[model samples]
Target: AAQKISEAHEHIAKAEKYLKTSFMKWKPDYDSAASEYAKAAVAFKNAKQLEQAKDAYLQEAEAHANNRSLFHAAKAFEQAGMMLKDLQRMPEAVQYIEKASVMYVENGTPDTAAMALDRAGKLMEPLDLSKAVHLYQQAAAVFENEERLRQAAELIGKASRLLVRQQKFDEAAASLQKEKSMYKEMENYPTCYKKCIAQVLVQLHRADYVAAQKCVRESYSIPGFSGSEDCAALEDLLQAYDEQDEEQLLRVCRSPLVTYMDNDYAKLAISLKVP
Candidate 1:
């Protein structure tokens, strides 16, 4: 085991030397260095040198970090933690994951970091939900502030999922509710417009034509409604609906909304129905 561990260290040193030279003498060959460092880590793990293996993994992680290769750095950290856990070194495993989480944040990949931290929190589970929630909340805040609504929603969703996994359904529901509100608040204008259109359609379908017309009129009256061709198309569609002109409604619906309209708008338009 000692011989194997020594060989692992030697390999790691060689990889590190290559990385250093690559940095100073020329452009770093991240692909080659990463592969060698990964090999060193495997060797250390085979030698049952958990700490040494972690160090080797960290060296590999640094290669990715230096190159801003965020996704791979995250994967390396996750793998290092798994190796430590396999060796029954829980504390060390958690430490490696935490380090990886920090790196993910530094790389502007908060959502990924949040995922890693959430995973680490689960491993630390017998500790306290409050602590875990705090970590998750920090990650959530990062995503929220960055305006990464999907990622923010995903992290919150993960948090909620974990709560469910823990059988804390009430808490999970409450957390999900909060996440829903956050998503609503992050609505881009196109989504809002689509939502308004959907509301109008629902009212019209319910034979609440008066309410539907009012909704359509109100939507158009709202600020930022006039300039968009989508709004104009919406107006045309609503007018056709009011006139009971199925042919015109269908035609307008198929005409496609403005190309310059955002992607979310296009998706919403495609989903709209006349009936």
Candidate 2:
């Protein structure tokens, strides 16, 4: 596999040399050459030579792009991005994926094209949270068209995580509400409860006692939750809020329920010094 990747790179370099030097005389054949490389990429992929295929497809994409063949360029870029992702070259893959997504949208098939862009956004999430949120929102709309509720919910969840990171707790809570609705539609009760717990903690830490109470009132069902440690923990946290006891709140935040909820926002929120 490794050797194949190296050889594929060599072929790409050769193609690069040709493209750089021959453009003045061979301009008309650019598209034809690109198509040939695209075909070679497919052959390599069929033979399980992934990296070679990726390199060839990327070369094909660049050739088409230089010739102003946006549609074919997009197709080639999408293939290259898929291979890059298969190789776990996520950061680099995101660039090509987004380019393909944009071209796919420009040439039609906006709905399907948006999915690739959304995937690229997920890849970019760790590098740029704000941008990830925006991309996830765009993806949610596209996925929503087919009533792809779970996929849309997943994107919403990604955006909500970034929102919580930004301390947009209220907005995050609202987003989670939508997520819970979607999860319910999919009949995922346990996951809904988990998200509900997350919202409860956020409201609690934000000191919206009434809002926190509302979440608690309509909480998701969990087995053995009644009179269990998780239930006690939530009640204690709310009790601390009512008493305005930062000390108790911190203790509650450190409880097993916090770990069960596994929310970073909960930890960050409770750790803040009260004004």
Indicate which candidate wins on lDDT: 2
Estimated TM-score for each candidate: 0.48, 0.61
Instruction: List, residue by residue over 1-275, the lDDT tens digit for candidate 2.
Output: 55544555555555655565454675445666586677668667766888878988987988888788878898888889888877877667767877886777666676667777687787767776777787788778777765778888888988887888877887888888888788877887667666766777667657676887887677635444454555666777777777778898777777665754445655654574432
lDDT of 2 at 196: 65
Q: Rate the local accuracy (lDDT) of all candidates.
A: 0.66, 0.73
> What TM-score should be assigned to candidate 2?
0.61
After superposing candidate 1, which stretches have Cα over 4 Å from the reference?
Answer: 1-7, 20-31, 87-95, 102-111, 142-275
Q: Estimate, for each residue in 204-223, the C-alpha lDDT of model 1 and write its tens digit.
A: 44556676566557556545
How good is model 1 by TM-score? 0.48
Off by over 4 Å in 2: 1-33, 36-75, 79-96, 102-115, 220-232, 269-275
Tell me which residue pairs clash in candidate 2.
Answer: none
